[PDB]
Swiss-Prot record, chains A, B:
It comes from the Viruses. Homodimer. Keywords: Bacterial host gene expression shutoff by virus, Degradation of host chromosome by virus, DNA-binding, Endonuclease, Host gene expression shutoff by virus, Host-virus interaction, Hydrolase, Nuclease. InterPro entries: Phage_T7_Gp3_endoDNaseI (IPR008029), Restrct_endonuc-II-like (IPR011335). This is Endonuclease I. The keyword Magnesium does not apply. GO terms for molecular function: crossover junction DNA endonuclease activity; deoxyribonuclease IV (phage-T4-induced) activity; DNA binding; double-stranded DNA endonuclease activity. Junction-resolving enzyme that selectively binds and cleaves four-way (Holliday) DNA junctions present after viral genomic replication. These intermediates are created during DNA repair, processing of stalled replication forks and homologous genetic recombination. Introduces two nicks on the two non-crossing strands, at 5' sides of the junction. Also participates together with gp6 in the degradation of host chromosome to provide nucleotides for phage DNA synthesis. Its EC number is 3.1.21.2. GO terms for biological process: degradation of host chromosome by virus; DNA integration; symbiont-mediated suppression of host gene expression. It catalyses: Endonucleolytic cleavage to 5'-phosphooligonucleotide end-products.
Amino acid sequence: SGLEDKVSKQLESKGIKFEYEEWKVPYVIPASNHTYTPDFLLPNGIFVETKGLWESDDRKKHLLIREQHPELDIRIVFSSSRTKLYKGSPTSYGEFCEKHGIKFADKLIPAEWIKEPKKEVPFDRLKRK
Amino acid sequence: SGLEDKVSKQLESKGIKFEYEEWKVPYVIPASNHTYTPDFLLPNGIFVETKGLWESDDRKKHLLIREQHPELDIRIVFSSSRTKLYKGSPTSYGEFCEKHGIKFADKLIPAEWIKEPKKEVPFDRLKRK
Ligand SMILES: [Mn+2]
Ligand SMILES: [Mn+2]
Ligand SMILES: [Mn+2]
Ligand SMILES: [Mn+2]
């Protein structure tokens, strides 16, 4: 960058030796705690997240919850599941869900989901509003 | 939102009793491993990072490195230490550095830093590029 060049030129002009980008320093970013509030909870225990724009951190969040709370049934209703992950991506929101086992639909909750037999929700692992 | 409105109306028309944002699901964003490569290493053991724009994640990284590698001497040379942390912030890069004990300078490496007595760098704690 202009600054790196100026600093390098200065050190050389004064005859100071130096190593440039020669050493890496390892570090760990600590794990962090968060909470996610799905939009709707149906009587049969299915949670439904309505979603327009679906950002990367949001997608990672769903994968984390699936690994951390396998018993939760969290599905997504998209304004459009055909939307691509980003400006030039080949993958759609829907394809991402298919790849990771996330049940999804577009615009409205499918009649079939509402009809699914009730199942237990581990509310003990959850926090009420 | 529009989608939330349409889904809730669909559920209400079918007489489905739902809970809206009534439950919070706790989750953890996993610790992550990284490496940081300072721009310059001077003969006396001082590492210097040249920096123009200095974003929030970059500032956080520097604090993590100071906590996890207290044996290293990492300083920063800014294009301008007067720059505010972000649009609207009353705090400058320099003030942030002062608060956290980070030595800094503007435009070039201080001749006085170059003159400081050599101190051994624990290379066994680092990884060569
Ligand atoms: Mn919501
Ligand atoms: Mn939503
Ligand atoms: Mn660099
Ligand atoms: Mn730099």
